[PDB]
UniProtKB/Swiss-Prot annotation:
Source organism (scientific name): Homo sapiens
Top-level taxon: Eukaryota
The record's account of how the chain is modified after translation: May be automethylated.
Region (Interaction with TUBA1A), start-end ranges: 1-234
Residues annotated as binding Zn(2+) 2: 60, 73, 77, 83
Tissue: Ubiquitously expressed.
Record gene name: SETD2
Domain notes: The low charge region mediates the transcriptional activation activity.
Function comment: Histone methyltransferase that specifically trimethylates 'Lys-36' of histone H3 (H3K36me3) using dimethylated 'Lys-36' (H3K36me2) as substrate. It is capable of trimethylating unmethylated H3K36 (H3K36me0) in vitro. Represents the main enzyme generating H3K36me3, a specific tag for epigenetic transcriptional activation. Plays a role in chromatin structure modulation during elongation by coordinating recruitment of the FACT complex and by interacting with hyperphosphorylated POLR2A.
Domain AWS: 41-92
Binding site for Zn(2+) 3: 175, 222, 224, 229
Protein name as catalogued: Histone-lysine N-methyltransferase SETD2
Length: 234
């Protein structure tokens, strides 16, 4: 159908008028970082030379101890600004577009080829404690037309993407997905991101397996079209 770049989502008034025309998804409150509703490690990498970086060597690449432990480097990194392990902080998300699919509503696609383990986008939302989550579950169990999406960070920290979020709201489900969520520590805070699990060619829909989040006592029929399709997302 039609397509949308992430900048289109940054003008609320132009967005609302495109959604009435069916040219953009339904309006929602866009946030580019988690909002908390209640007030709540150097790597052993050798800093790379000018000659090393030019010859193709990766600063805080696959061998970074921080990276292997899913910890981003701080501003105190030996590799400084050339450090490739500060993706959440530097907002180094993938080139992605929002597209209308045939059967699954709006979806996310790769606008460039994305190698395996590429940061796609952060899973953003309102972060809830115990009590707020309990009140929200109760409020949702009345509305019934509400499709609730939760991602636990830790026990007293649950991401709610149902009302506020970013374009990771458009990530559809697949039974044979090409993305996964990963939970990272970023300057002491737990953050979750979508990361590709294979090379995703340009134009390919970006998908994840919904079983790794908390969502709907309801069970939607599945149009992922995978050979291994389980028939439902419930
Ligand atoms: C924060 C990550 C998930 C945040 C929720 N994301 C929406 C997708 C955005 C929607 N597409 C739109 O248009 O806004 C979930 C809903 O999409 C639908 N959906 C998805 N995947 C399949 C499938 N595989 N088969 C059928 N429907 C699907 C179904 O209604 C489901 O509740
Ligand atoms: Zn490192
Ligand atoms: Zn680093
Ligand atoms: Zn399926």
């Amino acid at each position: 159908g039609p397509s949308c770049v992430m900048d289109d989502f940054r003008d609320p008034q132009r967005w609302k008028e495109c959604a009435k025309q069916g040219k953009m998804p339904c309006y929602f409150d866009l946030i580019e970082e988690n909002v908390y509703l209640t007030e709540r490690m150097q790597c052993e990498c050798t800093p790379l030379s000018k000659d090393e970086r030019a010859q193709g060597e990766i600063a805080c690449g696959e061998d970074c101890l921080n990276r292997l432990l899913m910890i981003e480097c701080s501003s105190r990194c030996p590799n400084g600004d050339y450090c490739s392990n500060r993706r959440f902080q530097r907002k180094q998300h993938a080139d992605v577009e929002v597209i209308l699919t045939e059967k699954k509503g709006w979806g996310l696609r790769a606008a460039k080829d994305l190698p395996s383990n590429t940061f796609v986008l952060e899973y953003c939302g309102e972060v809830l404690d115990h009590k707020e989550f309990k009140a929200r579950v109760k409020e949702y169990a009345r509305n019934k037309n509400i499709h609730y999406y939760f991602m636990a960070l830790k026990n007293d920290e649950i991401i709610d993407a149902t009302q506020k979020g970013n374009c990771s709201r458009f990530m559809n489900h697949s039974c044979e997905p090409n993305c996964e969520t990963q939970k990272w520590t970023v300057n002491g805070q737990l953050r979750v991101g979508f990361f590709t699990t294979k090379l995703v060619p340009s134009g390919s829909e970006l998908t994840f397996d919904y079983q790794f989040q908390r969502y709907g006592k309801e069970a939607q029929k599945c149009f992922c079209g995978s050979a291994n399709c389980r028939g439902y997302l419930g």
